[PDB]
């Protein structure tokens, strides 16, 4: 059976761009602390240069229907097309939202996309829609599907802007197809998994593998 | 085609605005459809250029 | 089955609409009765 | 014709604008629609026209 995305799953929002007649895969990323705006980390050249995947991981905290979201705002579940999802940055724990500020010189109607400290408001919620009619509203979102995200607050698609030389992500009225590639679904207790930060101890010697202190003469 | 655009905009105005007050349902639907099809706003309001 | 799924989604949406309100008015009750009668007929069809 | 089309479009959007009583009641849909209209039409452009 095809894998179905579920809440509490780490995912990376991925888009494809053609630069110099070459397909380039980019993942939505954000630092969170010191920079709330989202950029795009290329991942096609992974064999030669590792991507900074630490900041590209988002957790599907919660998925709701539109009416349920309206009621909740007024006051594991499989993702279904048409529902509203709440993406929380794994590192900073700030929620992906459609910012009111805009810095896109090319597009006047576009808005910046960035992280938000709190989940309050309708800016943090995004609605998934099928990219093609092969899927229909109410169908479970299969892993590897192409979907378009529409901001609830601004009614703007999550867009890849190639107008300028740089590739940038913004909320505009032009739609971009996004792939929600799973990173992890559920880790059984006590087992190591990729993307975990850990210390490598020398057996049980209490010795750990480490680089030299800061300002060392070996340049660390 | 500004002339046809104006005619259809006039019809949409009559559809949304009634007796000096806006009809909320029709206004919301019309706004959503217009934003979904940005070319309705005309070349000037088109975002990219 | 597809029509039943559509009807279930509509009923769930309508429940979400009325969840906040303390009491369902007569029009809401009537729409509930119509939707649930249609759902009962569909369930009987599947059973047969 | 171009000016007539743009005037008709702005008129239609203004009509689609939510009502003041809804805005005071703070209805989410009304505030969202007003924000969308404000984003579409800058105030400086209206003042200059």
Swiss-Prot record, chain D:
Knocked-out gene: effects: Perinatal lethality, due to severe defects in skeletal muscle development. Neonates do not breathe and do not move. Mutant mice show defects in muscle fiber development. Their muscles do not show a contractile response to electrical stimulation. In addition, mice display abnormal curvature of the spine, thin limbs, and an abnormal rib cage.
Signal peptide: none
Organism domain of life: Eukaryota
Subcellular location: Sarcoplasmic reticulum membrane
Tissue and organ distribution: Detected in muscle and myotubes (at protein level). Ubiquitous. Detected in diaphragm, skeletal muscle, esophagus, spleen, submaxillary gland, adrenal gland, cerebellum, brain and in testis germ cells.
Function summary: Cytosolic calcium-activated calcium channel that mediates the release of Ca(2+) from the sarcoplasmic reticulum into the cytosol and thereby plays a key role in triggering muscle contraction following depolarization of T-tubules. Repeated very high-level exercise increases the open probability of the channel and leads to Ca(2+) leaking into the cytoplasm. Can also mediate the release of Ca(2+) from intracellular stores in neurons, and may thereby promote prolonged Ca(2+) signaling in the brain. Required for normal embryonic development of muscle fibers and skeletal muscle.
Sequence similarity: Belongs to the ryanodine receptor (TC 1.A.3.1) family. RYR1 subfamily.
Domain remark text: The calcium release channel activity resides in the C-terminal region while the remaining part of the protein constitutes the 'foot' structure spanning the junctional gap between the sarcoplasmic reticulum (SR) and the T-tubule. Pore opening is mediated via the cytoplasmic calcium-binding domains that mediate a small rotation of the channel-forming transmembrane regions that then leads to channel opening.
Name of the featured protein: Ryanodine receptor 1
Species of the source: Mus musculus (Mouse)
UniProt lineage: Eukaryota, Metazoa, Chordata, Craniata, Vertebrata
Residues of the full protein shown: 2422 to 2470 of 5035
